[PDB]
Design a protein around this ligand. Sequence first.
Ligand code: FES
Ligand SMILES: [K+]
Ligand SMILES: [Mg+2]
Ligand SMILES: [Mg+2]
Ligand SMILES: [Mg+2]
Ligand SMILES: [Mg+2]
Ligand SMILES: [Mg+2]
Ligand SMILES: [Mg+2]
Lengths: 40, 174, 177, 99, 100, 38, 161, 162
Amino acid sequence: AGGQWRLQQGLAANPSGYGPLTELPDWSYADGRPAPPMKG
Amino acid sequence: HPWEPGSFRVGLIALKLGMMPLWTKDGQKHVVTLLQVQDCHVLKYTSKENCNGKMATLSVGGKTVSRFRKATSILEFYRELGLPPKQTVKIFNITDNAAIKPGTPLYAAHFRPGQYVDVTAKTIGKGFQGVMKRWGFKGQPATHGQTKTHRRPGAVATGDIGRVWPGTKMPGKM
Amino acid sequence: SSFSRAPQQWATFARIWYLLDGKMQPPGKLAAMASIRLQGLHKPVYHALSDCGDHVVIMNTRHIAFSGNKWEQKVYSSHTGYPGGFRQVTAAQLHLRDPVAIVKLAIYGMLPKNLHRRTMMERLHLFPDEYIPEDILKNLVEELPQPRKIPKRLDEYTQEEIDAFPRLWTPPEDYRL
Amino acid sequence: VKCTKARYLKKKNMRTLWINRITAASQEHGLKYPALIGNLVKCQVELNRKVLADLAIYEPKTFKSLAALASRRRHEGFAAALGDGKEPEGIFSRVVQYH
Amino acid sequence: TYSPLPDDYNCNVELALTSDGRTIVCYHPSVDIPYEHTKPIPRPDHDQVLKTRLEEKVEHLEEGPMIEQLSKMFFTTKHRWYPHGRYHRCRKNLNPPKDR
Amino acid sequence: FKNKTVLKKRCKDCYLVKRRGRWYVYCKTHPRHKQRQM
Amino acid sequence: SYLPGYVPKTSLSSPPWPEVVLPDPVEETRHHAEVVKKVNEMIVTGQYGRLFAVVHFASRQWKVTSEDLILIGNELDLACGERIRLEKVLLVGADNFTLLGKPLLGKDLVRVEATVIEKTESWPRIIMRFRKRKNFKKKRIVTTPQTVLRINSIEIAPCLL
Amino acid sequence: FREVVETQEGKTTIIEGRITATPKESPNPPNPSGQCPICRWNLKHKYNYDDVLLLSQFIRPHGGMLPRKITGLCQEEHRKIEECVKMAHRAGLLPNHRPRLPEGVVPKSKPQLNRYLTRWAPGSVKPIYKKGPRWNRVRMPVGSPLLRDNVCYSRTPWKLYH
RNA sequence: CUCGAUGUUGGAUCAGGACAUCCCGAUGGUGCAGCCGCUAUUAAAGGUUCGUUUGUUCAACGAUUAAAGUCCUACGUGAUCU
Ligand code: FES
Ligand SMILES: [K+]
Ligand SMILES: [Mg+2]
Ligand SMILES: [Mg+2]
Ligand SMILES: [Mg+2]
Ligand SMILES: [Mg+2]
Ligand SMILES: [Mg+2]
Ligand SMILES: [Mg+2]
């Protein structure tokens, strides 16, 4: 399910692991203000 | 049409009158059954195509009965044929060259001496019967200790299977 | 799609009629294709409870080809229930007795073993030869490609095809052959 | 107890339904399910199975495009495997690096 | 002339990457059914002095024959068409939730 | 015939043939040599 | 006229699949720029109607469109009525084109806004264990905090180059 | 090739032999160093029972195989081409290389059973009445183990037992 | 496994199954002339006696028979009997 290919690219085998898809904030205030950091 | 090998003609409906002896020149006695042909007519023709079987059929009817005791659809059929209703109707598989126009009378001389016939009827109804009369089971001894067991089936299967096989001979309508 | 709701619902869940040609086809690959369609497993709206199976018509079931020796080795077993009622027939004996049985038995075994299976059997239409009832013919929408490529007999190659292939060896001039 | 343990089945069966629907949707474009799922990952598209099945039902012009993209990447894999590394990577094979 | 998929049924797909290589652009206009791939709509299907009557074909069947007729017409088994008892009839939700 | 797991020619007219999917020994000189593969 | 590795035509002489010829990269990169320009023009001219997007929110992916409701399975620490931006967009699609992130689309390209319209808790959910013959039985009831978001708007900007 | 004709005239028989046209190997084999016709044309592991354009070159007019010394085939490829021609006959693919029929005998009709990849002679196989357990399952052979080394373009190898 | 019970050896009754075949069918070998045998391959559709004696299964004996098969079925079957 893509685990070995992501590893060949220096990515985590699981796309839930490190990287922008998981580590970037989920949302921001519509006005621009940043959200507080997510618990995880 | 003329007769050809492989050709199958119609039969009759007759009434069983009774039994009678006859003797052959050899002195041997044979019993015979008298079958009276009572108002036998052809009723219906079904082409080989519409019969759904490999042969055409010719429906024949036996004994005149009361128009007062027959269903309307049956009365409607006989009115169109122009005959009184028959008690029994039977289907005969014929070859195409043996078809007869419905309404045609059938007689005893349709058959001739020396020929062989198959006769089909319903057997004498004996009602619910035990295994001795129905299947020829031996039953059990009359004396020597037997407790309430003289005409019974005995065992009906083995212990292992835990059931009774389909088709097992048992008391029932005979 | 900007359809109204009912016509939208009608189109999405409609029954399609497929044609499949069984000539020279292994009955199991015919069965595998039909089983998907009878279930609706080919539809992205598939659900087991949505009753989204299709109609499959298969012609030329008399002209199926088994691979190997299965015509002689494959046995169909049954029991009448009565003592002595176990019956076993080869695929060949069964085929000559009933020319849709083998395809019917292959499909039936591939469908889910639940109560929807006999309903999916009512949307299956098996015909041993090229003849199909006209009412069935007018229902058809799409013919499925045959799952097995029929190889050409030597007599069916064009002279260009024969000429294209090279002669691999020289036979001695003095060999009787 | 059945209601407690049924939470594990509910998740497992939803995935099989999504896969079944995606397999249906891929076959309409001549793809097998692994060819679609495997190659989308190689394009750095992380759409999961629930979304892909939703697209297959409700956005079929998009789903066909996702099918074409995955089919395109698969052909780039075949071309790459035939090469000895001398030839450059395919257009859709290039990976965006993050740091 | 290379096409990843055929372009003759659902939409004409065109895949492209942006100059930066970070966005895949998919152009997919729908394909219309050509006129020539269509059929015309099927239009084709006395001395009477009496008002043509409705020839109402009021025909009644018994359950057996009726269920055989419904099973064939709709290509089901017979089992759907038999009734259910009060217990199951009274359990069905007659005001089910409706989503859109 | 005698059924045999190992077929052995007993003479010089005893010949080995496979028929009906199994090996046989047929001998026209000494018919008592006929064997069937078991 | 036979190469050293020539094989006459048989069933196995060549692979069963057809031969595929990929486009020349120089022409395709030019062809790509025309497609992107064509799609960028549709955005400038507003040649699109309703948009849908796929957003990554609260661990999962949501295919969303304007006016949609989504039920978030946790508290969000936002007041009811607060408007936020959804920042992880994987895909925005229209009738005639779709934009795909690798894995996420740029913020300059697409904008998704949602509104908190309810903060509630789920219905009670039973947690019961049982092991037979062990006098092992326990019951627990939980309610999960939830947030309902309404998707207000999906906006795309002609930032394709 | 060489023929033999027997003509009886006036109670006298004359048996002669004539040399007919002979085919010749196509020029420029892609691998002249190959030993047998197969390896000379890069054909090893690349033909099947249905490749009759190849198989028909190694059989007699009545469907029989030709000797190895005459064709030049390796012992190995001879066995592959031999099995392949047996299967091609049973598949109905050689409808002209049929057994010679003496005295214009008209065979009684047989049931048509289409088949392919038939390893055993049809009359020589018994029904599998007891299939056995899953761990000792009596299988049905499909194809020939002589062709196991054929080039496989799928990731799954040929299944020779069904 | 069953001791908060799975009671019964032989017989009666009704028999289901295996085939390692007693008889009937089709074969091969024979130290098979023939008549009988012996041995093997195939065959389980059909059949396979009545008595004296012993509680007996087992056996012996008297008469037969195409033959009086070997086995399994909770040592088949006792909410059917003895
Ligand atoms: S194939 Fe080369 S020696 Fe036979
Ligand atoms: K006890
Ligand atoms: Mg008595
Ligand atoms: Mg008493
Ligand atoms: Mg008494
Ligand atoms: Mg108790
Ligand atoms: Mg018995
Ligand atoms: Mg006992």
